[PDB]
Amino acid sequence: MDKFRVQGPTKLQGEVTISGAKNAALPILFAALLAEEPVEIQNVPKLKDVDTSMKLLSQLGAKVERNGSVHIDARDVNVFCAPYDLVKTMRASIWALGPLVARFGQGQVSLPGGATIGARPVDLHISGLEQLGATIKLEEGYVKASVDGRLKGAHIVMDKVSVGATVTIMCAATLAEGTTIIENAAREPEIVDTANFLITLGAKISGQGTDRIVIEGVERLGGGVYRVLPDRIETGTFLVAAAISRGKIICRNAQPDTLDAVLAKLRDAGADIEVGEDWISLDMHGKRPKAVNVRTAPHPAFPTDMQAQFTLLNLVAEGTGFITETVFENRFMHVPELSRMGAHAEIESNTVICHGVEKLSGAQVMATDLRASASLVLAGCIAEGTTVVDRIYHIDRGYERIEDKLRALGANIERVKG
Amino acid sequence: MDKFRVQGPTKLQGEVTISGAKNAALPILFAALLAEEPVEIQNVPKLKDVDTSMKLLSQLGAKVERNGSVHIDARDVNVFCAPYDLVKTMRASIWALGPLVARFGQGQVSLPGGATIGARPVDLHISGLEQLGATIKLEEGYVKASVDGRLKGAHIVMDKVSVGATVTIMCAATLAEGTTIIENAAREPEIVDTANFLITLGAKISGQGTDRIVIEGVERLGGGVYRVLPDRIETGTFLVAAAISRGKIICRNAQPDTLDAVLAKLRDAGADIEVGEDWISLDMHGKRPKAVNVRTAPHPAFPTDMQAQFTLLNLVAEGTGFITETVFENRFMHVPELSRMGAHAEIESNTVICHGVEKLSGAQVMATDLRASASLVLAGCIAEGTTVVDRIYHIDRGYERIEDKLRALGANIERVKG
Amino acid sequence: MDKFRVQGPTKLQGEVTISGAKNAALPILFAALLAEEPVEIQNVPKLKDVDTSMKLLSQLGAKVERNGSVHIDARDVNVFCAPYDLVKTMRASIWALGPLVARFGQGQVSLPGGATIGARPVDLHISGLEQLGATIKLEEGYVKASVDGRLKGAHIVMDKVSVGATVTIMCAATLAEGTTIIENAAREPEIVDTANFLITLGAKISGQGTDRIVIEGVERLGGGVYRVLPDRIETGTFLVAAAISRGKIICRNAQPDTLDAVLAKLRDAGADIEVGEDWISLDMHGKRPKAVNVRTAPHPAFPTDMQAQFTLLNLVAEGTGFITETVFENRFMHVPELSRMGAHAEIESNTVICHGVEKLSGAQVMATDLRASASLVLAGCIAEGTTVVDRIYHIDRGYERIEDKLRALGANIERVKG
Ligand SMILES: CC(=O)N[C@H]1[C@@H](OP(=O)(O)OP(=O)(O)OC[C@H]2O[C@@H](n3ccc(=O)[nH]c3=O)[C@H](O)[C@@H]2O)O[C@H](CO)[C@@H](O)[C@@H]1O[C@@](CF)(OP(=O)(O)O)C(=O)O
Ligand SMILES: CC(=O)N[C@H]1[C@@H](OP(=O)(O)OP(=O)(O)OC[C@H]2O[C@@H](n3ccc(=O)[nH]c3=O)[C@H](O)[C@@H]2O)O[C@H](CO)[C@@H](O)[C@@H]1O[C@@](CF)(OP(=O)(O)O)C(=O)O
Ligand SMILES: CC(=O)N[C@H]1[C@@H](OP(=O)(O)OP(=O)(O)OC[C@H]2O[C@@H](n3ccc(=O)[nH]c3=O)[C@H](O)[C@@H]2O)O[C@H](CO)[C@@H](O)[C@@H]1O[C@@](CF)(OP(=O)(O)O)C(=O)O
C-alpha cells in the first residue's frame, strides 16, 4: 500500500504548470463512444481513472492510444457491456451507459460500487435516460439500459443539480429524435467543456454554462480535435498549498474564470491574488491565512471539491472559520485525520467549525478520498516533523505527477513501498 | 431570497391566536380527492403548501376556492397524474396517490425530491398500497400506481411508525373491498383528524388515536363540512417563544390535549402552565428556563417537530440539557447556526448535548428547514443585536402570518427584499 | 420494558465459560433448510434470535427441538414464505431465502425492517442470488425470489465485503449446477464454521477463511452433527469487562485464534494476556488500561462488533484513544449514553476521539443496540453509584445468561420489572 512520507515544515513556493481537468477528461472520454470518425483529445492528464476509462473504451471495441492526448477511434465498438473488472474501480464508467443507449440501443454498466463521500445514487441518470425513451432494468449488480430505435428528446427538469446526470442526459440527447431541454442543468465548466466537445463532433447544443441546456438530436457524430480545459481543483489545490504555507506561487496553464469563488475566498484569507489570461499568482507575503467562512454548493458557488483543502487552510489560519458542506454528506472524513495532527475542529451536522492553530504536528494519517488525500499531503508539508499519509493511491486519481510538482515548490515528499 | 432581520433582545409576551394544523390540513386536502359531493374544510391555515396542494387539486380537475376555509368540489377530477411543477415543492403530494388509486384505479405522483431532515423514503406508502392491491411502478421520477378494479382490504402490520404511510393506507382503504386493519398505526392527532374527516364524508373507520386502525370499505364517499384542529407545533413554538424570553403568553384556539408531552417538558424548564379547554398560558415569571432532557419519538411522546425549538430553549437555559432525536436522521442542521450566535452544543451521534448560555449574540444565519427557520427567528428575538435569517421562505410553509404574530408579542422583525 | 440496575464500582474478576457463537449459530440454523436428513447442531447459545429462528424453521415445516443443541429435521419443509411476525424481530431471517431458492425453486422473506447501526441493505444477497440464476422481485415489503429449475453456479466477485451476503451465496451455491466462485469473500470465523457445517452435510466447498471461496454444487445434502465455535465477541466482551475494571479473568471454551486483533489491542491497553488451546486469560495486575487506537474493518482486522466495548475501554483508560468505525455508519449511539455517565468523547465523522477519565459516574442510560447494551452494562459495573440501563432486551439477543455470568465475576446487577 504505497504511503507518502512528508517532512515539514516546508514552504511551498515556486511555480506549477496546471493539468487538464480530471473531471472534463473523464466525461469526454465516454462521450467519444458516440463518435463515428476518429477523435483526438488533447491535454488529458495521466490519472488512474483516465487509464481505467481507456481500458474500457477498448474493451468495448474502440481503438485507443495516448500520450499527451488520448486517441480514440470508436467506429467499431461492438461490445455494449462493461466488464465489472474495469468498472468497480471507477464511478465514472456510468457514463458509458448513455452513449451506448443513444447510439447502439443498449448498454450495460455495473452499478458503481464503493462509496466514500456519500451514498452517491445514480437515480438521476436512470431517470433521464428513461425520460428520453430508455428502458432500464437493474439486476445482478448491473444497470441494463435499452431502447428499440432512437431515443426521443424530452423536456427534462432536473430535480436536483447533478453534474453527472446532466452529462448523461446531455450526451444521450445528442443522438435523439428531436429536442431535449434540461432545466436546472448543472452549470460547471466541465459540463460546458464536454458540451463543446460534443459540438466539435457536430452535436447541436446550446445554453451550457446556463441552467437550461438545449440539445437537438442529430443522426451521427463525427470526429475531431478537442483540448481539455485546465483543472480548477488542481489549481485551487496548489493555491491553497501556498497560502497555508505562507508562500507564493504561479499557476501556469490556468483558467481564472473557473475559480472566481475560490479566489475571492483566498482574497479573504488574506492572499495577494493576481491573474492573467492563462495564469494565476498568489502571494501571501510571508503571512498566515485568516479564517474564512465557506458554504459549498454547485457552480458557480464554492466547489465541494475544494472543501477539504479549505478545511486545512482554516485549521492553520488566524481565527474561527465555519465550513458548511452541502453537496455531499460524508465529506468530513479528512477532519479526524487532521485532528491527529493537532487541529481544532468541532463538527456540528453539516458544518465543520474551525479553530485555527499556528502549527500542526507531523503525524500518521490516512487517506480516505481524493481531495482528502491531497489535503493530508499539503498538511504534512507544513506540519512539524513527519507525516505519513497511508493509502496514497487516492491521490493518483486526480493529481498527475504531484510529488514532482510539490517537490518543485520545495516540498519534501517521499513515496514508500508499503 | 427574502430574509428576516430581527433585533434583540426582546421579550415575547402577549397573546396569540393559534391556526389550523398545517399537518392536518395537508392530509385532508388530499383525502378530499375521494369525495364525491362538495367539501368544505374550515380553519385551513394559509401556508405555502396549502397553496401548492390547491393548485394540484385543480390541476386534476377539482373545483377549488378558499379563504378561511378551502372549498373543494372533486366530482369531476379527470387527470390522474400530478405535474412535476406542483409536486417538487412539496413532499405532501404523495398523498394524492392513494386517493387516485382507490377511487380511479390509477394515479401517478412524482417521487418527492429534495430532502432535508433525512432520506425520507416512501416505501411504506408503496408497500401498503401494494398490499391492498395496487401495482406500483417507479419510472421517470414517478410513482405510477394502478389497480384494475377495487382494492381489497388487507391486514397491514406497519413495520415502523409513519404518520404519512398510515394516511395513505387509511385513505386508500376507505374505498376498498372489505376490511383493512393497520397495526402499529401512527397515533398522532392529525391522523385522528384526518380519519374523522373521512368519517364525515362517510367512511367507516375506528380506532384512530390507537395503534390499530380499522377501516371497512364503502363504495362512495360524500361531502360535508370539517373544521381543522389547532396546530400543536405552532402552539409549541409560541410557548417556547415565551419561555426562552422569560415572558408569558396566552394561546388562544388551542387544543391542550395534543401537547401533553411538551407541556410537561416546559413544566420542567420551569414554566407556569395553565390550561383551559381551548387555551393554554405559560408564565415564566421573569425567570430563565432550566435545562431539560428530551428524546423524540412518535405521538404521544415528545414530537420531533418541536426538537429544534427545544434545542434553542436548552442552549439558553440553566444547565446541561441532552436532546436525542430519534425519528429523523438529519434534523440538527439548526445547531451550527445557533452556534454562530454563541451557543454551546456538542453533537454525539443522535444526541445534541446542550450547555445553556445566558445570552446569544445576534448573527447571520441560515434557514435549513421549517422548524429550524422558526427556531432561528425566535433565537434572534432574544439575541443581542441583529440577526438576519436567510431563506425565510421555509417559515412560510407552516406559520401563517408569523411576523405579525411575533410582532404582536413585542418582537422586532423585518422582512427584507433579497 | 426490562432494565438493568447496576451498582458500582465493582471489580470483574473470576472466570467465565464462553458460549457458542450467536453469529455462527444463526447462519447454520438457516443453512439447515437445505438438509435432507436430520441435523444436530451442538453448542447453540440461548439467544432471542435463536428462538425466533427456530420458530420460523418450524413455521416452514421443519421439525425442531432443542436444549444444549438444536435438533432440526427439515425433510418436510413445505412452506416457503416466512411470516412477517417472526421475521421483523430479526434481520437474520433473510438467510432463509437462499436455502429456499436453491432447494425449492422459490422463497419469500420480508425485507428486514428496523435499522439501528446503519441502513443495512441486502442488495448483495439479491445480487448474488440473481447472478446464480434467481429472479427476485420486491413487493409488499417482501423479497420474493424464485428460479425454475436449479441455480447455475457462477463466478461472483463481491463488490464489498459482506459476511451475510457471502453466506447467502455460499449456501445457495451448494445446490447449484456447477461451480461457484466467490471473490472477495468475507473471511470471518462464522463463515468458515458455516461452510464446515455445509461440508458435514456433504457440500463441496473450499477456500473459506480465504478471500475466495469455491463451491461445487451437489444434488442433495444430508444430515449430521456440528458443534458451534466459541463466540469471540462474547469473549472480547468479557476480556474488556476485566481490563476496564482492573481485574483478571479466565475465558473457558474459547478459541484464541479468532481474536488475534483484539488480543493485540488489549496487549496495548496494557493487559497481561495468556492463551492456551481453548482458553484465554487476561491480567491487568491492578492497573488501569492505556488508550489504544482502533480502526475497524473485516476479519481478520479489528471487529466492528467490539468497537462499542473498546469505546468504553478508551473512555476510562489513560490517554487519548481514537477509534474509527468503518464497517457500519451509525454505530456510535453508545457514545452520548456513555457521556451522560461522565465520559469525554468528540465525534468527528467516522471517528470517536476519546479522552480517558479515571472514573465514570453511575447514570441512567439507554440501550440502542446489542453491543451498545453490553457496553453500557459493563460501564455501570465500573461506574460510581447506580446505573440503570433501559431496554435491556437487546442484550438478550447475543449474551446468554449474562447477569449470571457477570455476577459470577462479582458484579452487582439486577433486572427490574419495567
Ligand atoms: C468524475 C466527476 O465528474 N466527478 C465530479 C462530479 O461527480 P458527480 O457527478 O457524482 O456529482 P453529482 O453532481 O452528480 O452529485 C451531486 C449530488 O447529487 C447526488 N446525486 C448525483 C447523481 C444522481 O443520480 N443522484 C444523486 O442523488 C450526489 O450523490 C450528490 O449528493 O461532480 C461532483 C460534484 O460537484 C464532484 O464533486 C466530482 O468530483 C470528484 C468526486 F467528487 O470525482 P469523483 O467522481 O472521481 O470522485 C472529485 O474529484 O473529488
Ligand atoms: C406534512 C406532514 O404530515 N408532515 C409531518 C409527517 O411527515 P412524515 O409523514 O413524512 O412522517 P413519517 O412519520 O412518515 O416519517 C417517519 C420516519 O419514517 C421514515 N419513513 C416514512 C415514510 C416511509 O414510507 N418510509 C419511511 O422510512 C421517515 O423518512 C422518518 O425517518 O410526520 C412527521 C413525523 O412525526 C413530521 O415530523 C412532518 O412534519 C413536517 C416535516 F417533518 O412537515 P413536512 O412534511 O412539511 O416537512 C414539519 O412540519 O416539520
Ligand atoms: C447475525 C450476523 O451475522 N450478524 C453479523 C454480520 O451481519 P451482516 O451480515 O449484516 O454484516 P455485513 O457484513 O453483511 O455488512 C457489512 C457492510 O455491508 C453493508 N451491506 C451488507 C449486506 C448487503 O447486502 N449490502 C450491504 O451494503 C452493511 O449494511 C455494512 O455497512 O456481520 C456484521 C459485520 O462484521 C456483524 O457486525 C453482525 O453482528 C451483529 C450486528 F452487527 O448481529 P446482528 O445482525 O444481530 O445485529 C452484532 O452481534 O453486533
DSSP letters, C37-49, are S-EEEES----HH
* Bond before A336 cis per omega within 30 degrees: no
Which cell numbers hold the place of A120? 452517491
Q: CA C328 to CA A99: how far, in whole Å?
A: 36
Q: CA A308 to CA A300: how far, in whole Å?
A: 18
Question: Which value in Å is the resolution of this experimental model?
Answer: 2.8
Determine the 3-state secondary structure of C109 from DSSP. Answer: strand
Amino acid at C391: R
Number of helical (H) and strand (E) elements in chain C, helices listed first: 13, 23
Q: Which of C312, C321, C324 has its CA nearest to residue C351?
A: C324
Count of residues making up chain B: 418
List chains touching B (3+ CB pairs under 8 A): A, C
Residue C160, judged by CB atoms within 10 A of its CB (0-12, 13-18, 19+), counts as middle
Question: CA C307 from chain center: how many Å?
Answer: 13
Q: CA A119 to CA B330: how far, in whole Å?
A: 14
Q: Which of B283, B284, B336 has its CA nearest to residue B311?
A: B336
Contact list in B for residue C330 (CB cut-off 8 A) is 329, 349
Q: Which of B225, B176, B166 has its CA nearest to residue B203?
A: B176
CB B342 within 8 A of CB B313: no
Q: Which of C273, C279, C231 has its CA nearest to residue C248?
A: C273
Q: 479489528: which residue's cell?
A: C302
Q: Which of A322, A317, A369 has its CA nearest to residue A343?
A: A317
Q: CA A80 to CA A63: how far, in whole Å?
A: 15
CB C249 within 8 A of CB C239: yes
Which cell numbers hold the place of C200? 458435514
Q: CA B28 to CA B43: how far, in whole Å?
A: 12
Contact list in A for residue B335 (CB cut-off 8 A) is 348-349
Q: CA C193 → CA A175, A293, C33, C88, C197, distances in Å?
A: 54, 54, 16, 26, 6
Which cell numbers hold the place of C163? 459476511
CA torsion A73-A77-A79-A80 (nearest 10°) is 100
Q: CA B416 to CA C21: how far, in whole Å?
A: 64
C332 and B348 in contact by Cβ < 8 A?
yes
Closest ligand 1 atom, CA of A370?
A: 50
Residues whose CB falls within 8 Å of the CB of residue B151, separated by 6 or more in sequence, listed in order: B101, B102, B132, B133, B134, B172, B173, B175, B176, B177, B217
Amino acid at A70: V
Pairing of strands A155-157, A179-183: parallel
Which cell numbers hold the place of C113? 425492517
Q: CA B346 to CA C346: how far, in whole Å?
A: 8
Which cell numbers hold the place of A317? 489560519
Count of residues making up chain C: 418
CB C108 within 8 A of CB C86: no
CB B41 within 8 A of CB B25: yes
Determine the 3-state secondary structure of C389 from DSSP. Answer: strand
Nearest chain C Cα distance for residue B350, angstroms: 7
What DSSP string describes A337-395?
HHHTTT-EEEEETTEEEEE--S--B--EEE--SHHHHHHHHHHHHHSBEEEEEE-GGGG
Q: 506549477: which residue's cell?
A: A16
Q: CA C207 to CA B173: how far, in whole Å?
A: 53
Question: Of chain A residues 86-125, which have a CB less than 8 A from chain C?
Answer: 88, 113-114
In three-state form (DSSP H/G/I as H, E/B as E, the rest C), the secondary structure along chain B is CCEEEEEECCCCCEEEECCECHHHHHHHHHHHHHECCCEEEECCCCCHHHHHHHHHHHHCCCEEEECCCEEEECCCCCCCECCHHHHCCCHHHHHCHHHHHHHHCEEEEECCCCCCCCCCCCHHHHHHHHHCCCEEEECCCEEEEECCCCCECCEEECCCCCHHHHHHHHHHHHHCECEEEEECCCCCHHHHHHHHHHHHHCCEEECCCCCEEEEECCCCECCEEEECCECHHHHHHHHHHHHHCCCEEEEECCCHHHCHHHHHHHHHCCCEEEEECCEEEEECCCCCCECCCEEECCCCCECHHHHHHHHHHHCCCECEEEEECCCCCCCCCCHHHHHCCCCEEEEECCEEEEECCCCCECCEEECCCHHHHHHHHHHHHHCEEEEEEECHHHHHHCCCCHHHHHHCCCCCEEEECC
Q: CA C391 → CA C5, C337, C400, distances in Å?
A: 11, 13, 16
Helix (H) or strand (E) holding C386: strand C385-390
Q: In what order do the strands lie in the sheet with A385-390?
A: A364-366, A385-390, A3-8, A413-416
Which cell numbers hold the place of C303? 471487529
Amino acid at C107: G
> How large is the C-alpha radius of gyration of chain B?
21
- Phi and psi at C362, nearest 5°, equal -60, 140
**Residue of chain C whose alpha carbon sits nearest to that of A110:** C159
Q: CA C60 → CA B53, C29, C77, C89, C280, distances in Å?
A: 47, 13, 5, 17, 40
E strand intervals along A219-377: 224-227, 248-252, 272-276, 279-283, 294-295, 320-324, 344-348, 351-355, 364-366
Which cell numbers hold the place of B357? 448560555
A141 and C160 in contact by Cβ < 8 A?
no
Q: In what order do the strands lie in the sheet with A142-146?
A: A106-110, A142-146, A135-138
Determine the 3-state secondary structure of C351 from DSSP. Answer: strand
Helix (H) or strand (E) holding C336: helix C335-339
CB atoms within 10 A of CB B46: 16
Q: CA A41 to CA A30: how far, in whole Å?
A: 12
C130 and A140 in contact by Cβ < 8 A?
yes
Q: Which of B105, B99, B194 has its CA nearest to residue B146?
A: B105
What is the B313 CA–ligand 3 centroid distance (Å)? 39
* DSSP state, residue A308: H
Question: CA B398 from chain center: how many Å?
Answer: 7
Complete domains list, chain A, with CATH: 1-18+230-418 (3.65.10.10), 21-228 (3.65.10.10)
Residues whose CB falls within 8 Å of the CB of residue A162, separated by 6 or more in sequence, listed in order: A124, A186
Q: CA C390 to CA C387: how far, in whole Å?
A: 9
Contact list in B for residue A350 (CB cut-off 8 A) is 333, 336
List chains touching C (3+ CB pairs under 8 A): A, B
CB atoms within 10 A of CB A378: 26
CB C96 within 8 A of CB C65: no
Contact list in B for residue C88 (CB cut-off 8 A) is 157, 159
CB atoms within 10 A of CB C80: 23
CB atoms within 10 A of CB C297: 16
Q: In what order do the strands lie in the sheet with A155-157?
A: A155-157, A179-183, A212-216, A204-206
Q: CA C288 to CA A88: how far, in whole Å?
A: 46
**Residue of chain B whose alpha carbon sits nearest to that of C335:** B348
Q: How many CA atoms lie within 13 A of C52 on its CB side?
A: 22
What is the C269 CA–ligand 3 centroid distance (Å)? 27
Helix (H) or strand (E) holding C86: helix C84-87
Amino acid at C118: G
Assess B351–C contact: CB distance below 8 Å, yes or no.
Answer: yes
- Phi and psi at C128, nearest 5°, equal -80, -45
A347 and C350 in contact by Cβ < 8 A?
no
Q: Which of A113, A137, A108 has its CA nearest to residue C157?
A: A113
**Distance, first Cα to last Cα, chain B:** 4
**Within 6 Å (CB) of ligand 1, which residues are found?**
A 22-23, 26, 91-92, 118-125, 160, 162-165, 304-305, 327-328, 370-371, 398
* DSSP state, residue A270: T
CB C342 within 8 A of CB C319: no
C141 and B160 in contact by Cβ < 8 A?
no
The region that residue A113 occupies, defined by phi over 0 for left and psi between -120 and 50 for alpha, beta otherwise, is beta
Q: CA A252 to CA A257: how far, in whole Å?
A: 14
Amino acid at B391: R
Determine the 3-state secondary structure of C150 from DSSP. Answer: coil
C348 and A330 in contact by Cβ < 8 A?
no
Q: CA A245 to CA A410: how far, in whole Å?
A: 11
Which cell numbers hold the place of C379? 460501564
**Residue of chain B whose alpha carbon sits nearest to that of A127:** B140
Q: How many CA atoms lie within 13 A of B243 on its CB side?
A: 34
B348 and C339 in contact by Cβ < 8 A?
yes
Closest ligand 1 atom, CA of A123?
A: 24
The region that residue A133 occupies, defined by phi over 0 for left and psi between -120 and 50 for alpha, beta otherwise, is left
Residues whose CB falls within 8 Å of the CB of residue A264, separated by 6 or more in sequence, listed in order: none
Assess C336–B contact: CB distance below 8 Å, yes or no.
Answer: yes
Q: CA A275 → CA A258, A260, A281, A301, distances in Å?
A: 12, 11, 6, 19
What is the B92 CA–ligand 2 centroid distance (Å)? 9
The experimental method, as deposited, was: X-ray
Helix (H) or strand (E) holding C29: helix C22-31
CB A303 within 8 A of CB A233: yes
CB atoms within 10 A of CB B404: 11
Q: CA B360 to CA C305: how far, in whole Å?
A: 42
Count of residues making up chain A: 418
Per-residue b/e over A54-85, b at no fewer than 16 CB within 10 Å?
bebbbbbebebeeeebbbbbbeebeebbbbbe
Which cell numbers hold the place of B239? 410557548
Assess A141–C contact: CB distance below 8 Å, yes or no.
Answer: yes
Dihedral sign, Cα of residue B375, residue B379, residue B381, residue B385: negative
**Distance, first Cα to last Cα, chain C:** 4
Residue C81, judged by CB atoms within 10 A of its CB (0-12, 13-18, 19+), counts as middle
CA torsion B51-B55-B58-B60 (nearest 10°) is -120
Q: CA C280 to CA C263: how far, in whole Å?
A: 9
**Residue of chain C whose alpha carbon sits nearest to that of B324:** C336
CB C69 within 8 A of CB C40: yes
Q: CA A379 to CA B152: how far, in whole Å?
A: 64
Q: Which of A235, A190, A169, A175 has its CA nearest to residue A27?
A: A190
Which of A156, A159, A161 is most worth mutating to test chain B (most B CB atoms within 10 A of its CB)? A159
Which cell numbers hold the place of B196? 374523522
Assess C330–B contact: CB distance below 8 Å, yes or no.
Answer: yes
CA torsion B195-B196-B198-B199 (nearest 10°) is 120
Residue bearing the CA closest to ligand 1, atom 43: A23
CB B384 within 8 A of CB C384: no
Q: CA B398 to CA B373: how far, in whole Å?
A: 10
**Within 6 Å (CB) of ligand 3, which residues are found?**
C 22-23, 26, 91-92, 118-125, 160, 162-165, 304-305, 327-328, 370-371, 398
Pairing of strands A142-146, A344-348: unpaired
Closest ligand 1 atom, CA of A122?
A: 24
Residues whose CB falls within 8 Å of the CB of residue C414, separated by 6 or more in sequence, listed in order: C4, C5, C6, C403
Q: CA A33 → CA A25, A95, A195, A365, C250, distances in Å?
A: 13, 10, 14, 40, 65
Assess A322–B contact: CB distance below 8 Å, yes or no.
Answer: yes
Nearest chain C Cα distance for residue B59, angstroms: 30
A140 and C160 in contact by Cβ < 8 A?
no
Q: CA C246 to CA C285: how far, in whole Å?
A: 7
Q: Which of B179, B180, B178 has its CA nearest to residue B166?
A: B180
**Distance, first Cα to last Cα, chain A:** 4
CB atoms within 10 A of CB A337: 27
Assess C332–B contact: CB distance below 8 Å, yes or no.
Answer: yes
Q: CA A288 to CA A356: how far, in whole Å?
A: 10
CA torsion A243-A244-A246-A248 (nearest 10°) is -30
**Which among C85, C140, C335 has the least Cβ separation from residue B348?**
C335
Q: CA A323 to CA A321: how far, in whole Å?
A: 7
What DSSP string describes A8-71?
E-----EEEEPPB-HHHHHHHHHHGGGBSS-EEEES----HHHHHHHHHHHHTT-EEEESSSEE
Q: CA C142 to CA C164: how far, in whole Å?
A: 18
Q: CA A332 to CA A321: how far, in whole Å?
A: 15
Helix (H) or strand (E) holding A235: helix A232-244
